[PDB]
Paper text:
SctX proteins are secreted substrates and are essential components of type III secretion systems. The dedicated chaperone SctY escorts SctX proteins to the secretion machinery, where the hydrophobic helix at the C-terminus of SctX mediates recognition by the export apparatus. The type III secretion substrate SctX binds its chaperone at two distinct sites: (i) its α1 helix interacts with the concave groove of SctY and (ii) the two C-terminal helices α2 and α3 cover the large hydrophobic surface formed by the N-terminal TPR of the chaperone.
We were unable to express A. hydrophila His6-AscY in E. coli, but were able to solubly co-express AscX with P. luminescens subsp. laumondii His6-LscY. The AscX49–LscY complex was reductively methylated to enable crystallization and diffracted to approximately 2 Å resolution. The asymmetric unit contains two heterodimers related via a tNCS vector (0.000, 0.500, 0.500) with a height of 83% compared with the origin Patterson peak. The two AscX49–LscYmeth dimers in the asymmetric unit are virtually identical and both exhibit the α3 bend in the substrate as described for AscX31–YscY. Notably, the bend occurs at the same residue, Ala106. While the C-terminal end of the α2 helix superimposes well between the two complexes, the N-terminal end is rotated by about 13°, resulting in a shift of about 6.1 Å of His76 at the N-terminal end of the helix. Furthermore, the α3 helix appears to be rotated by about 10° in a similar fashion, with Ala106 being displaced by approximately 5.6 Å. A possible explanation for this shift is the presence of Phe12 in YscY instead of Ala10 in LscY, which causes steric conflicts with Met79 in the α2 helix of AscX. An exchange of Phe12 in YscY to Ala10 in LscY and AscY allows the repositioning of SctX helices α2 and α3.
Author numbering:
A (entry chain B): 50 to 63, 67 to 118
B (entry chain A): -1 to 105
Write the structure that this text describes.
């Protein structure tokens, strides 16, 4: 459990979406592409982020706090 | 136009997966990160997050192979070997885990 912080830091990317206008354009453009995918990996992800629309406020808050 | 993501759309998807991983949903993160790597397999930031998501899912063998791809992409972060060691410990490869952990401390 001690190494969990260093693993999360490794998974954290080292900003282009700081402006809220750019964030909404990125999300709408992302949902349009995955909805056109036919592979089971793209279809499963298109279902998942459609259920994360209520989490968009938590997303933008995390970006600005880094 | 085309089954592809812009630079900002790739970051958005990476952020969606990283948030799931942060909040202890590695299965949901893996779903979003696999899609990002299906459309842009060269996305290194997406792959590192998938490695950690797989470790949290006790999928050490898969996580180690994704680290191998990072290594040959030019990944030179020392924490890469911490993931390899953790992946080998999940699979019982204790001697390989020690070898990888020595490289983590060397760099
Ligand atoms: Br965009
Ligand atoms: Br395409
Ligand atoms: Br496995
Ligand atoms: Br699996």
């Amino acid at each position: 459990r001690l190494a969990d912080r260093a693993l999360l830091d490794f998974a954290t990317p080292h900003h282009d979406l700081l402006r809220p206008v750019d964030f909404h354009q990125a999300m709408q453009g992302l949902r349009s592409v995955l909805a056109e995918g036919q592979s089971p990996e793209l279809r499963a992800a298109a279902i998942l982020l459609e259920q994360m629309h209520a989490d968009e406020q938590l997303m933008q808050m995390t970006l600005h706090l880094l | 136009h085309g089954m592809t993501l812009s630079a900002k759309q790739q970051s958005a998807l990476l952020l969606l997966g990283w948030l799931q991983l942060q909040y202890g949903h590695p299965d949901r993160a893996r779903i979003l990160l696999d899609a990002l790597l299906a459309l842009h397999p060269e996305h290194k930031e997406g792959r590192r997050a998938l490695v950690v998501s797989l470790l949290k899912l006790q999928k050490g063998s898969m996580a180690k192979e994704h680290c191998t791809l990072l290594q040959e992409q030019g990944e030179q972060s020392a924490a890469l070997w911490l993931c390899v060691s953790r992946a080998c410990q999940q699979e019982g490869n204790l001697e390989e885990a020690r070898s990888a952990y020595q490289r983590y401390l060397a760099q």
